[PDB]
Design a protein around this ligand. Sequence first.
Ligand SMILES: [Mg+2]
Ligand SMILES: [Mg+2]
Lengths: 251, 50, 50, 1340, 277
Amino acid sequence: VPLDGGRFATSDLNDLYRRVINRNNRLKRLLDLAAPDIIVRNEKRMLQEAVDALLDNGRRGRAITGSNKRPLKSLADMIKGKQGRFRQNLLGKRVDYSGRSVITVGPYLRLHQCGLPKKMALELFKPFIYGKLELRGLATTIKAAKKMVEREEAVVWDILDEVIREHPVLLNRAPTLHRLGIQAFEPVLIEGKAIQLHPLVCAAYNADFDGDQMAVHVPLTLEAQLEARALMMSTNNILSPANGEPIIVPS
Amino acid sequence: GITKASLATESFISAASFQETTRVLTEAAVAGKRDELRGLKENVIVGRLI
Amino acid sequence: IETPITANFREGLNVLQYFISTHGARKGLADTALKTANSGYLTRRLVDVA
Amino acid sequence: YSYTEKKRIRKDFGKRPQVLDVPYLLSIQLDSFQKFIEQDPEGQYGLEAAFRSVFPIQSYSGNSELQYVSYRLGEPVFDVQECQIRGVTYSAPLRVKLRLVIYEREAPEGTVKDIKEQEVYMGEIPLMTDNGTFVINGTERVIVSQLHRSPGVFFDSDKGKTHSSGKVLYNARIIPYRGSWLDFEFDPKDNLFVRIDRRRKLPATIILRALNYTTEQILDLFFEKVIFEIRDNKLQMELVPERLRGETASFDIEANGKVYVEKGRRITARHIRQLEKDDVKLIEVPVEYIAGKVVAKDYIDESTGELICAANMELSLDLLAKLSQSGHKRIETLFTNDLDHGPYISETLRVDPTNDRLSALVEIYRMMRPGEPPTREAAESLFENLFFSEDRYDLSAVGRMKFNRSLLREEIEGSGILSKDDIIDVMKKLIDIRNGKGEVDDIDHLGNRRIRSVGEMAENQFRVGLVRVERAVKERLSLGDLDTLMPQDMINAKPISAAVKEFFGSSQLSQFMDQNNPLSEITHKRRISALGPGGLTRERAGFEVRDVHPTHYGRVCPIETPEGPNIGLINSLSVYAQTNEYGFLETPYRKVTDGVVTDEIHYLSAIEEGNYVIAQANSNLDEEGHFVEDLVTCRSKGESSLFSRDQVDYMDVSTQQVVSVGASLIPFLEHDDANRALMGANMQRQAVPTLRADKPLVGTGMERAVAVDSGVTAVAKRGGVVQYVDASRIVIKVNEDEMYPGEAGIDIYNLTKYTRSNQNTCINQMPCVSLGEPVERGDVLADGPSTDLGELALGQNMRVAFMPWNGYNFEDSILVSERVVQEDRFTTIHIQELACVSRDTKLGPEEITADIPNVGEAALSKLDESGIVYIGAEVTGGDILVGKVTPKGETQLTPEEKLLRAIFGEKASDVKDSSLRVPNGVSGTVIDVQVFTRDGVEKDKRALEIEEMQLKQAKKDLSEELQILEAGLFSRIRAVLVAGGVEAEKLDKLPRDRWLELGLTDEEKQNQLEQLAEQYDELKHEFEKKLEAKRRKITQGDDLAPGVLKIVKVYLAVKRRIQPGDKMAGRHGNKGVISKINPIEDMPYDENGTPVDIVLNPLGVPSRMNIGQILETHLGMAAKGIGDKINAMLKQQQEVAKLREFIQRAYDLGADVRQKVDLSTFSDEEVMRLAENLRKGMPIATPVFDGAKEAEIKELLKLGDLPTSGQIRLYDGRTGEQFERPVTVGYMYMLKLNHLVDDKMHARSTGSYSLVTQQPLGGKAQFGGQRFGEMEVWALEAYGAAYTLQEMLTVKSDDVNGRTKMYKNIVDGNHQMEPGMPESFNVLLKEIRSLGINIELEDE
Amino acid sequence: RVLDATQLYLGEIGYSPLLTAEEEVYFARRALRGDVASRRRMIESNLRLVVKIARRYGNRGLALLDLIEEGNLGLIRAVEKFDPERGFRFSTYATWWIRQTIERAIMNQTRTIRLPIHIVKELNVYLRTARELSHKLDHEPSAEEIAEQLDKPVDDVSRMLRLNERITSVDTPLGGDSEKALLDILADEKENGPEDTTQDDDMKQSIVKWLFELNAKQREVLARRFGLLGYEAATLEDVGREIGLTRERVRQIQVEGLRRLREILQTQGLNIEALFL
RNA sequence: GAGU
DNA sequence: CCGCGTCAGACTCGTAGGATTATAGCATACGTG
DNA sequence: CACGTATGCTATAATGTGTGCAGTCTGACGCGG
Ligand SMILES: [Mg+2]
Ligand SMILES: [Mg+2]
């Protein structure tokens, strides 16, 4: 692919394949020319080397390196290990409708609630806002709805307030060691950029407010929303699944 | 042991995704093994329903 | 160490007491950063087999 | 005290007279790089060293050769300032004089054939700034010193390698600075082996055979002798009493006529001493005893001439009888013992498959070049080129020195190539260690770890560039013509320039200077890293090296190192520590002679320190006599205990020398746990400078030093009176006594105004002098970004109360008063940089016009004709900063757009829209704009306007220069003319332009006039050329990247006020996030009515054991109490006398206050300015371990009429009722850290997706989604939330069809899931098939 | 066992005997006359020359073995085009072929995006010229400085230097830390987000609704001609041929339908005007 | 570099 | 048994872009506007 | 015919690589001699 600045950027595989093709096509030439057998041999070894590099580089011997010194990334490296397909892109994924911020206390909150910054919530619920805008007849089209939310009009705040009622959101803190590291709450919209977390579930998150941050996720479907409110809501999940003990305890 | 028990499951997608993936795949490719996708791992990889 | 720290924090440690404290402190802190990998790896293997 | 100290004196609670002042803090950086460029004539250093190392070089043929003469750095074409603006590297061109000499092949070495000598350019080398940074591509960057294992010898042993046996296997390693490693090691069978570069293992004696040692000689080297004389018929043995020790007497040991030991009897001490005293030398012994003694030398039958026994061969009854009858009645056998003198080499010769020297060379050759046919040539060449070639091997002076001292030699310096003795001696010491005498070293000991600063590293990379070019040179010399070929035609600059640019750029050690704070810069430049090239890896690092080592005392801080994976490896330098000339660390100590503690100071290296017993600084001195107390607390051999007074050799200079610079800034460090203090010192570096530079009430004293030494403050070069103060500059006229007789003698300092830092903070210099003030040399004229009157001002002190409050300070959460925000004291400036690039594409050039399709007039209002926003303009997210348009190619317009464009006509123009706009939800004021056009592209109208400014402003700057220089220069001539022909006002009457024609009598003062006259014209012509240069540079059309026609840089300035989510902390590792900003009405308030500023949770004290914060608060309140008393007195205006009485008593409070500060020297007005400053709160210095004691602090509180508890009655602002018990209240000095919630908040519904995997990108700058990782997935599995999981795997990530369908469903209300297959899975299969594994889906 | 490809090959070449002049001449006479052995013996005996030369040309083009094979190809051309009758030695002649072939190979394969020889050689002279310029100008050379030296267009120089822009690996990780690389940042720009895709659905569907507002005749004419509800953008003759002969009448009804759409827009255009972004 |  | 090899080694967040070298000179040949 | 891209040939003799780094990590579990 071309970078903006007229540079090109390519996969290492292309370099590896260029080696193989060149060596194989040279072999065909050497055979057409009926070359002496020692040269035929060297080329056959050459071919095997390049193929081995293509499939799994640093397996048989010295991995074939770039100008950077670093061994080129072969096919097997894309399947193999943490950088590999499975671990990195398949068993765990990047996710839309996800946000993050600093967390701070919400002593006023009840157990099933969390402070959700307005700005953040406006973006997370974008399509829900556009859909409701079209039912209000406020937005003629999607382009108009978009421009209406950019301008952040006062009717949009009323609509946003409407949508987020009864809609659970998931809060997560890293590392997610047990299931209670992800819990669902009813969001309470707040002006100001930090998430407010309820004190009593700080236990389960191991959250202390020395600058800790948390991630927010929007359950989209009726099914996911139900899963969140029923299975994952903080009020519903009190006891440690490990020992039969209440994990929400005053501290 | 835990490591070998996971590698011993009939599901080769679960096995390969766990560890040892070059070896797991040569084993399965030679055996002509088929995974009918009973486990959660396997379903999550293909983005299906647990 | 053969010599213990006779002082307390309200009293305030001298150079030598403070220096002597450092070793243990830092050993602990390093353990947090580095050993959590091995603990977590245990978590991962258990998870995979169950 | 100095003039600046008269303005505000800090109160010192220290008691220990400071014998040694803190050095220049940025010594390391500067001294090092100074040595790198310093051209040393003999003792090659840096550059000079690199040239001599490589040069002179000759061709492959040997007839033509290049020799080095001398180098010179050109002065930098662009100064630092311009470099930062343009984005260029500040460097000097390296021109080197070189001489191409050719030899005749017909004559033996006909040097008078062809000699061509000329100057060749080869790379620009970056220069170091005044403060130890480099300017690389317009950004300040610091290369951090490295810490590695010193070249030399090192003996080690894995304590029970094979855990089964658990036998200790000792090894030697010789580590050179450049070359192969040479390892000696024992195996379980006690045989000595050798390996090169950990290749395969070889018998150790094989290496000695390579050095041409026969077997006989090898035994003679390592072993002793046991002599056997064969007399008459009985066998006699030559005896050394102290060999037969710890052994069992095998036969009946007797001498002349006295039987000592019997058969099977233990030979103790008594026996040995008996025998020695009796003078026993020969002893009759049994012949059968010989069987098993190893013969040392060869013996041949002189008759036959054949070998009776070869060397190193076990003797027997037959061999011995045969030897006797041939005529040998004396036989050298080896002395050997299982316990003391172990027979290692004897056994190793039996395992040695080689025979002679040549055979040994072949085996060596065959190890490292296996399979390949050996030739004698090749074997000889290889072995010599390993450790015996000048070119490829070099221990360096450090290596040889360390090696010689480890071998207990006398001579320090010597050859960097291994001599035969060297090798043998390492083997011998290894063997000594095996026998039991000697010990193995440790790597973590600072005697074995060496510090490698910038200069030496630059030197190394520069050698490499030379070596690359050397290859090219040799190859081209060989083929080259002798006559036509010039030397500079063979040399290429590119390899060298590349290697150096790569170092100051690609290297780990070279990084963006951390400049969000003066302290941050200073400590960063004082950092040491064990990482990087030739160092340890985060993954390769154990815990041994990481933890705090005994040798670190006084050299490295134990309390300053990151809590990350970089925990052990990155470390800050201790205060008084310094780099030894060879590269080891060293610390000052005061020598104690006869108990008497001299003021002579000695820097001790790590190794030297172990030898002496060193008293602690806390010992009480007997007023320059000796130690008061008979028992003194000291340390040696890395361990601490009591000693007598006369036993003491040295003593610690300062109480601070144990700690680093950062840690020293922590007051009451003595009362804080080291863990917390680590975090405290680390977090102090992250303090963001506020709008208003507030000094810290409760300081330490290091504040002044840091600020001044960092160089961020403007300091005065020469004392004198200030001629012109200004926001933008300071002109000071120098005192006659310091003022040189040449120039006018007026110093001019232009101050650097509102400039962008690397962390997007705001760097502005303020003047801290009044107009017409007399100022002393080395006073602070202008404060840097986080400095106040010369002191370091990182944060701001404020009124704190420790108490819970409605959970709003739950777990370190912080409740702050609105008052703090209103007063804008924590408010901060951030200057961000936005650039708009106009590139030339395949379709045609992008243009920077304001003519863009579909833009509102509201938008174009703030843009000028050119399409650039005006200076001053306030912007908010979405506003266009620089308008830019791009040529669009053909696009197949959907039939809908065909229909619609037919309906409206409005055919869409050829041009798109790539305009640079304000990033969303950032908002500020455009404070500067800069335009870069290429050399030939027609300039923007706006670019011309900017150039107009620059030209006219440049002219003013230079004109003011010659104006104030001409004024100060004639003012001198006026005074010289008075000394002789005084006509003061009569000379000023007729014009000053006709003045220098007037002379004096022929004296020294007439010559002074000639000197001022010559300089005045010099300045006249100089001013012409300077301005021409200025004009060129302004006109100069910039060389940008290929493809880029022109670039516009906009600088926004944003004012950020604190809010909930921001991060705040003290210096004791006490963090917190702001939870809530409370109205002032609600804040807890004291009886007097004064409300608290912050309410911190006291639950974060006992557990944490950071008690420094509590003492800081108490002392803080006392500091303020005195401030309020002075303030009350100033409001009433009692009089000078009364103020002075109170203030003297106050300064001189403490039990053993070191500093006396007599107010009788101060004149009345000096007292007034001082009190004026002290009214805010009297500033106090608590040194590190030498701090203020509880008693002293409570006495200060009584002077404030404040309680001894330091707790006060507080009232709840909401109710008006008092809290149940007294609350601890005072001033803690707090900081706002760089972690603004503004930068951390992020949210995303839908956006761009990744290229191959199709899942959303990561990071807030790329508008990324969060990763829901394996850990996060497991959570949902546990819960059983199946659809939420699937949702995140599919519609929210890869599933392309699914995401779009889901979006449309969501807009239509119906929250239906329409899932498919993740594209990343598809890709997996394809990847597997490209591997050549058939992986197919069998469908239903 | 030495399994080094290189070492094995070098050993095998070593065990073939070096030739004298008379031998080369005899062999080569028969080689031109076709003696399979002769050609083979000359090749195999002179492999060692090839390795000496490939040793030099390596450096930064390519792997030593890759250079050796291309070099061998040059040597084969030399054995085919050798003249025994000319007194000039073989090694001298072969050297030319070997160097030629290696250099040409490292000019087409050395670059990921294959640069033609012409471009490459142009560019090289710009480079060597830049080096002389930098040798006297201390500082590196500008595009226009090099262009002034060659007396040529700056655009020429610039375009050449743009081609010399060497590739970046997508897999190379950024920030020293082996974490996320270029691929990890790099979006798919072609693939629009569900927001853009859903906006087009909304657009296209609003046009259906607007088309139904019009007359059945106008709407059908517009649909068929625009290729909107039809398949192919039927020309005037196609639409007329299927409905009303008069090709001219298709234009009449079409233009009429466009103007009725404009009326709907002046009335209810309050939604349409916002589609201008 | 941030919280574990 | 020994010794050499291969395999594993927590989770989210951040920052910043980026590097190098060099391939002669000319004559003939093939494909598209 | 021209422009862009390609193939081609050259004659003093020259005839076996190396090059630039790697820094050593660890506790475990199998696999040829
Ligand atoms: Mg906590
Ligand atoms: Mg925390």
